[PDB]
């Protein structure tokens, strides 16, 4: 357990939620993982370090950094905590333009289709596929198990390509039953 450090830059639009949730972020990092936590206000980057005399799990530092990173991407705290709890969760990230070059109102409607009315469609994918989805403008992040994120990705991509939400919803029930 050698002295190591990680730096995770916080984008400005995630600083204020980081403030309100800081009380629930440093306890698990400093207690379970035995990590030395700090935020450099000058650089606005969360700094994590291994304490050689106290830290014991070699994977604590990287485990903590991914947890901070998950919150940074826009995932709620409790969902990010799942990265600390478990060891088999990964984040899939891809853009709308990667699937299809959509611009103007076509891009706006594609984002609206993925989220659905009142976010119903996004929750439908999240529940069926056992994953969490953050829809940041045209940037989509999916969190979950490796086999699970791929299933959610396919359901999302079908929506981008133009498949109506209703048909995608039925497909979610089928895979959900298989799960």
């Amino acid at each position: 357990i050698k002295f190591e450090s990680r730096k995770i830059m916080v984008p400005p639009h995630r600083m204020t939620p980081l403030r309100n949730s800081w009380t629930k972020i440093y306890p698990p990092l400093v207690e379970h993982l035995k990590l030395q936590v700090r935020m450099n206000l000058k650089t606005k980057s969360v700094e994590l370090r291994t304490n050689p005399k106290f830290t014991t799990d070699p994977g604590a530092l990287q485990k903590g950094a991914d947890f901070i990173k998950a919150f940074t991407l826009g995932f709620d705290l409790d969902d990010s905590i799942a990265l600390l709890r478990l060891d088999d969760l990964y984040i899939e990230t891809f853009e709308v333009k990667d699937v299809k070059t959509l611009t103007g109102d076509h891009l706006s409607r594609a984002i609206g289709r993925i989220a659905g009315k009142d976010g119903k469609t996004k929750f439908a994918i999240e529940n069926a596929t056992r994953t969490r989805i953050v829809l940041a403008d045209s940037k989509i992040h999916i969190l979950g198990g490796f086999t699970h994120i791929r299933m959610a990705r396919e359901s999302v991509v079908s929506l981008i390509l133009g498949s109506p939400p209703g048909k995608v919803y039925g497909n979610l029930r089928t895979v959900a039953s298989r799960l």
Partner: protein, 127 residues
């Protein structure tokens, strides 16, 4: 007492590479890929494949004398996705657990100022 190399991780859709080289990048120390550690071609991009590849290079690097590596993770980039996949994320975690000191982690994905056309076509791809 502390020798640095560079650990290049190329996380594509259908495979993950873990390549460790000297600081310059000319000399290869150990290249292991997801395919060399799995029986079925479906699981080459699987995180489990990356972990085995990362552990193998970590063991090999310790034999050579390399004790720390700078991580330069990258995706396919170009006209395709720019963020490393879970195969790359898994490879990074395994390298940390291996005891090999992680110096600095940066994303070096090839990002185009503006690129050629994408292979999908007007209607898109990746059904």
């Amino acid at each position: 007492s502390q020798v640095f190399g560079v650990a290049r991780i190329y996380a594509s859709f259908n495979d993950t590479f873990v390549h460790v080289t000297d600081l310059s990048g000319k000399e290869t120390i150990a290249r292991v890929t997801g395919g060399m550690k799995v029986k079925a071609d479906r699981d080459e991009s699987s995180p489990y494949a990356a972990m085995l590849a990362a552990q193998d290079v970590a063991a090999k690097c310790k034999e050579v004398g390399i004790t720390a590596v700078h991580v330069k993770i990258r995706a396919t980039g170009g006209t395709r996705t720019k963020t490393p996949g879970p195969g790359g994320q898994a490879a990074l975690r395994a390298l940390a657990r291996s005891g090999l000191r992680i110096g600095r982690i940066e994303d070096v994905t090839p990002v185009p100022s503006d690129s050629t056309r994408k292979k999908g076509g007007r209607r898109g791809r990746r059904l």
